[PDB]
Design a protein around this ligand. Structure first.
Ligand code: CL
Ligand code: CL
Lengths: 873, 869
């Protein structure tokens, strides 16, 4: 067995529009062909290129061949490559960047997740003369055509760290690569491998050279094992497979298309010419392939041959099959023989791995396609004698009792031979609907995002299969790029409706969020506001749709039970008998629970705060979330404090003033029954606190002068001298709370610095209660020191504006996110998912798979490349 | 750790005439350089090519580089290449053909012994634009530049049958190549592997290219880890090593130069820029090397750096070292660091294996050579405190205490990296010496002789060593020559003589053969070849000979008084060669012993043939008769001819048979025609009166009849008179199926051993020896080499004559074995030489017991210019 290697993904660019393994299966299955005239768009002097006489120098006797449809197109911004470098790059490299991205995308892996891993690269490639003719301080022009860079550049671009090797063994290049990668894998030197070949003809060089030799079919058809075998027909290809040991695919959960069971390489040495095949040599590689995995010939159902259609090489190839595979035999199980080159020509370095594509595609589509141009088999072989049988039609090849196996052989003109044995993979709607599902798309440009939304738009309306799978597939399975957009939708018509809006550049729409970011992650600050953000709705829908949130609400009710007789879930529910949100000593606990429970919900989706900050009593919640306070000590505090506030009802009062701290401070000098400056929240937002009669007189006092003062709905003057008289009951009710080390940076709005959780004494909480809360300064200092994403953890965003203000004016922060979490006519799961989208799109990562337990990833289309023509004269 | 891969051999073409590993060592020892002007034989437009401002399109600001001496020169006939295919071959491919040839020869292997073997070939190569505008029904101009054909062509021409892979990883291609080879060896997919790389710049392209980026050292000196590091300095090289697993190299007796302990490959990944080096990546590749072979950093003594002499790459490289090998280190045994490129430049695809060559030569010579251009080490590194110490001067590095280990690192511009750990290897005559030389042309034989004569003057020399190595270590080609010498002075005389292009001393023989193998006939003549002293020096010498002689002496012991041993040494009062009853048994015993000598040396007859009594040694040699039975016969019929003396005579007539018969009718007392030996060679036998008359009628028509020194008349009618006792005396013989074909000259047909009855032996004695038309018949059924196994050659020209009048051989060879005053082993060797030199193969090692093979020079290629214009 030993640890057998899986084919985990595939990708191609082949002649005729075949830019997808699916499109190649459709070609094989309709039994079609992709020959076409020489390309009109590569600069070739087509008038002078053609001449019927082989011996005529400098010309080709064939004007048919297999060519890629737009070999010059390339998305260069996508690959961080400039217009000039692109121009200088061989198409072989450009198509490999595209193909290898497709290939990983195809295997259901976010490409970015291979960054830094021992992923390796093994390629067949050679120069065709793209460099040559027309004469770079960056040396784009040596690096753009070097075969060694074709490997390298895939690694550099994708961040891979395994071996990257380019191999030239001619028309076996890609099977040799496969063989090297298995070993690399077999021995742990590579964890996955990208394996293949590229061949894109820059010049008609190969046509002219081989016309000299009379080596080309006149038709341009590669008639494998047919009576007309005429010569080669050359084609272009860029084909790739992704390999991983079977054990490792399972453990990561990657779908396995097939299994490389074994393979062999050899050389046929002293043949009848450097040029010519060797039948003994072929018999030998075949036999050594079978033995290297423990198989006997009988175990193999089909061979996808080298089959070039060369008058001399087909008989040699077939007889060698007849001498190995054909020896034993049920006269009712012959070895099925065909070749891709009949469909799509000879793709040179991409030849052998293209052999694989067909094989793996036959495996998974349960049948063997026909080979073409075989109305009559070549007369130089005994066919109906011995057991090798051309695939004149397509045959069933279905999962049954008998294991399915088939082999690929490839044999270059330098004489190095490969033969790989492929085996079917071992054998293989888990709940869904109702419920919100986030759809996030991204792309490296505006045009790409619009396209990316539109192809997902059209996927979802294919009623086939649906909502959360596309959701999960989008989240765990595509890279997250700079341009992001997100739809929260619970119904597929809803979703396409909003992807369309995105595709259409028509921006807005309610549950549709768009954004742009250059960080792929940030330093997150959770901000816990004071009272003011409460609504009678608050946590209801959440309690019934979210186990994590009801989790904490339930824990809080548990911690608070000895301190009161009403319970938060009951107030959140508005049950008959619910205390109502009028009395501070109900509000402040309820809010603590809510704020603290949301913080929890955020952490569910992997958002961990690097710091917290809190406004007034909000610091208690902040403090519990950094973990400086157990839930019981937090509750003790929040309840002790507010029960007192409720005793002080009528004794004092508070107001917001549309003015700066200093102006307010000159204004308050005639008083002391009202040295407020309770709170400073921004330049035009300052709270003032003290005896009613000095407040009324001071506030009225600037209705003259037209300075805005709004009164805050509160029955007491906190952060003022009118607080001094509850100090003892407080330090009493609440001493020997036991504060601990903070897991998270706690920046205090009272002390105006980071505070070890150990300093969060009962005396500190008194100070909180007693002193001006320095809210704008806190936020400002945090933005000065690098923090990037400011998230208000409340029922309604009361401090967002204040945050946008403090960030705005602070050195270097025109790249920062401020977000709330719930609003008044919009608390509930999808509202919250909307906040997270809003945070996501400006750079904060969320683990969306939490919103989708049970869901299974839908296979998605690949990146929407935004191509431009690159090509030199 | 257990059975890693031995490097058993080394080969190179580097700049400055550096065409031999030891010349490479000469260079590292003297701390020399190979910088030179741009070559004037490659068709570059030198006048326009060079210009000091980097910005200027089309040009280089550098005018110096490392280049080969004869990049265009190739011996195409040697490799079976047509002068057309050759002009069209990338120099990279031609040099790879030559250096791979040398590599195997450097190993002490006959490169023909690898034909049909699983030897694999793993090379770094890339296209430099050889054909790209000169401007061919054979495909020579396509196959001639294909990177894949540079490996494939090695396998095609040497009959090698393992994987042959071309690999382009840029600057690390060779080390990648190495890694892949080691894997294929470790898993038994190849038995041996040729590994290395090739780089030959056909066009100034790289120079124009890396000028435009100011990447080139102004100077062109690759100042690795130097203060004044300036950029690359490019060079050409072709460099190979021969790998194989320790255990195989021990089985075949291949000398192990060093050991590839451990090895790893990785990638920069997403670093600072596609062609930029990554420190983190260098750290990880080092640590994977160490961890995959069970070593720890402190177990390594030296590092052969990628050391390109770039201002930006060296500190990165050195800090990686300083971060893995130095970190912990003893103050006292720090890591020695140097780079071959200080010496010879960046040789590109070949850079890695060339570093590797450096490392091994350093292993063989017990020292680490100095790195150059380090008067002041770069200050961007911190040599100050700890582990890394630049090889400012040569350092001793000898076998002994700790195992010696060094690493070679290599880092391509494509970001693929390589770190490989190399460890040290584990723990006369007075007599004649045969020296065989061979080559593919006569010019080349003269050169090979020439170069071996030079070898043999070096005080030291060792005749038998050079002999042992010429014989067991080199292909045997078409043109062949041989000297049989007992001293150095005389060997040199002989070779010099072959190299002079004319003339023979007896000790020297030349030949041209198109076979490397013959179908041998052993011929066993009769009375005539006897000479006093015959066996002697050979008894005292050659025990194979003495043993059979002794074996004959037992056999004959119940049958006579005298020892055959005694007759050769001429013992006081020993029988003497004047009477048949001695002469016959002695010749039986000598011929039979000589036949065991030839077989000693691996010459096994495919048929034997006999003249009259020589059919008895024939029949024993073939296995039809035991030694006892054959002795009964030889003694049996010798004894009846002493009792027939003076009764008859015998005489050669120089006339054809038919006409001899036409003259024999009036005397049927000579049903002579005793023997027919050729067209003017017939033997007559009978009553002495009758013979006198016939002779006197002969003389008198001017027909020459001489008389034979014999007193009896075998094959005559007089013999009917003794048939009696012959059968009584000679029955009880048990013929026995023979291993080897017995072509009878009595009956003229291959015979079947078991027909060799007493009654057949009587016919032998009575009927006429049809010797000519026996040999002609053998010659026509495709037998090819005729060895007269006798002590003087008595049928050789009769056999020559018979062979020329037979369709088939323009080309047979006929040699004898000894001569009258050339008995002795060195006479016998020059006899085998003569036969060898025409295609009979000989196990010559047999002549040099206990010798030790001596390193030789490689094939002296006869090169012509090939270049496209
Ligand atoms: Cl066979
Ligand atoms: Cl590290």
């Amino acid at each position: 067995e030993s640890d057998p290697i899986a084919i985990v993904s595939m990708a191609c660019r082949l002649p005729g529009g075949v830019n997808t393994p699916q499109r190649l299966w459709e070609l094989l299955r309709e039994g079609g062909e992709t020959l076409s005239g020489f390309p009109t768009d590569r600069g070739w002097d087509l008038a002078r290129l053609h001449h019927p006489d082989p011996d005529n120098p400098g010309t080709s006797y064939v004007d048919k061949g297999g060519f890629l449809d737009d070999a010059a197109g390339f998305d260069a911004e996508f690959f961080g490559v400039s217009p000039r470098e692109a121009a200088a790059m061989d198409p072989q490299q450009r198509l490999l960047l595209e193909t290898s991205w497709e290939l990983v995308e195809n295997a259901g892996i976010d490409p970015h997740s291979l960054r830094g891993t021992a992923t390796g690269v093994f390629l067949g490639v050679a120069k065709f003369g793209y460099g040559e003719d027309t004469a770079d301080v960056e040396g784009y022009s040596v690096t753009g055509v070097a075969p060694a860079v074709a490997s390298g550049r895939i690694s550099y671009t994708m961040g891979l760290e395994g071996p990257s090797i380019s191999v030239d063994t001619a028309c076996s290049s890609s099977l040799v690569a496969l063989h090297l990668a298995v070993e690399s894998l077999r021995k742990g030197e590579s964890s996955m491998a990208v394996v293949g070949g590229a061949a894109v003809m820059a010049t008609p060089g190969v046509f002219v050279d081989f016309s000299r030799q009379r080596a080309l079919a006149a038709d341009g058809r590669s008639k494998a094992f047919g009576a007309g075998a005429d010569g080669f027909g050359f084609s272009e290809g860029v084909t790739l497979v992704l390999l991983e040991r079977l054990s490792e695919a399972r453990r990561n959960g990657h779908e396995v298309l097939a299994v490389v069971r074994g393979s062999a390489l050899n050389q046929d040495g002293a043949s009848n010419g450097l040029s010519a095949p060797s039948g003994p040599a072929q018999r030998r590689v075949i036999r050594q392939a079978l033995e290297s995995c423990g198989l006997e010939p009988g175990d193999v159902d089909a061979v996808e041959a080298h089959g070039t259609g060369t008058a001399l090489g087909d008989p040699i190839e077939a007889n060698a099959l007849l001498d190995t595979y054909g020896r034993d035999r049920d006269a009712d199980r012959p070895l099925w023989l065909g070749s891709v080159k009949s469909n799509i020509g000879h793709t040179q370095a991409a030849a052998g791995v293209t052999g694989l594509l067909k094989v793996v595609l036959a495996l998974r589509n349960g049948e063997l396609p026909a080979t073409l141009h075989v109305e009559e088999p070549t007369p130089h072989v005994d066919w109906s004698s011995g057991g090798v049988a051309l695939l004149a039609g397509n045959q069933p090849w279905r999962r049954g009792e008998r294991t399915r196996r088939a082999a690929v052989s490839a044999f270059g003109i330098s004489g190095t031979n490969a033969h790989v044995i492929v085996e079917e993979a071992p054998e293989r709607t888990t709940a869904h609907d109702g419920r919100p599902v986030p759809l996030v798309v991204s792309a490296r440009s505006t045009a790409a995002l619009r396209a990316q939304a539109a192809q997902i738009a059209e996927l979802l309306e294919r009623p086939d299969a649906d909502l959360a799978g596309v959701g999960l597939g989008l989240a765990t399975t595509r890279a997250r790029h700079e341009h992001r957009a997100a739809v929260v939708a619970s119904t597929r018509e809803e979703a396409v409706r909003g992807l369309r809006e995105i595709a259409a550049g028509a921006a807005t729409a309610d549950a549709v969020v768009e954004g742009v970011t250059e960080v792929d992650g940030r330093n997150v600050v959770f901000l816990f506001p004071g009272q003011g953000s409460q609504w009678a709705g608050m946590g209801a829908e959440l309690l019934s749709s979210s186990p994590v949130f009801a989790g904490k609400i339930r824990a809080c009710d548990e911690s608070m039970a000895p301190m009161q007789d009403w319970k938060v879930s009951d107030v959140l529910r508005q049950a008959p008998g619910a205390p109502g949100l009028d009395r501070v000593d109900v509000v402040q606990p309820v809010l603590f629970a809510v704020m603290v429970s949301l913080a929890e919900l955020w952490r569910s989706y992997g958002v961990e705060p690097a710091a917290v900050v809190g406004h007034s009593q909000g610091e208690i919640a902040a403090a519990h979330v950094a973990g400086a306070l157990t839930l019981e000590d937090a509750a003790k505090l929040v309840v002790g404090r507010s029960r007192l506030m409720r005793s002080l009802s009528g004794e004092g009062g508070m107001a917001a003033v549309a003015l700066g701290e200093a102006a307010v401070r000159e204004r308050l000098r005639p008083w002391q029954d009202r040295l407020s400056v309770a709170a400073v929240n921004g330049p035009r937002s300052v709270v003032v606190s003290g005896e009613p009669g000095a407040l009324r007189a001071f506030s009225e006092d600037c209705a003259a002068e037209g300075i805005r003062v709004r009164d805050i709905d509160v029955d007491y003057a906190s952060h003022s001298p009118q607080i001094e008289r509850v100090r003892e009951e407080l330090l009493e009710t609440t001493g020997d709370i036991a504060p601990r080390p903070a897991r998270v940076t706690f920046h205090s709005t009272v002390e105006s610095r980071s505070m070890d959780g150990t300093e969060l004494d009962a005396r500190y909480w008194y100070r909180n209660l007693r002193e001006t809360v320095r809210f704008a300064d806190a936020v400002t200092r945090l933005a000065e020191s690098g923090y990037d994403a400011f998230i208000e953890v409340s029922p309604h965003p009361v401090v967002v504006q204040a945050v946008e203000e403090a960030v705005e004016e602070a050195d270097g922060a025109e790249d920062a996110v401020v977000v709330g979490s719930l609003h008044r006519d919009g608390g509930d799961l999808s509202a919250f998912l909307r906040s997270m989208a809003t945070a996501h799109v400006s750079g904060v990562d969320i683990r969306w798979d939490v919103a989708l337990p049970g869901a299974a990833p839908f296979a998605l289309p690949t990146y929407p490349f935004q191509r431009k023509r690159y090509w030199l004269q």
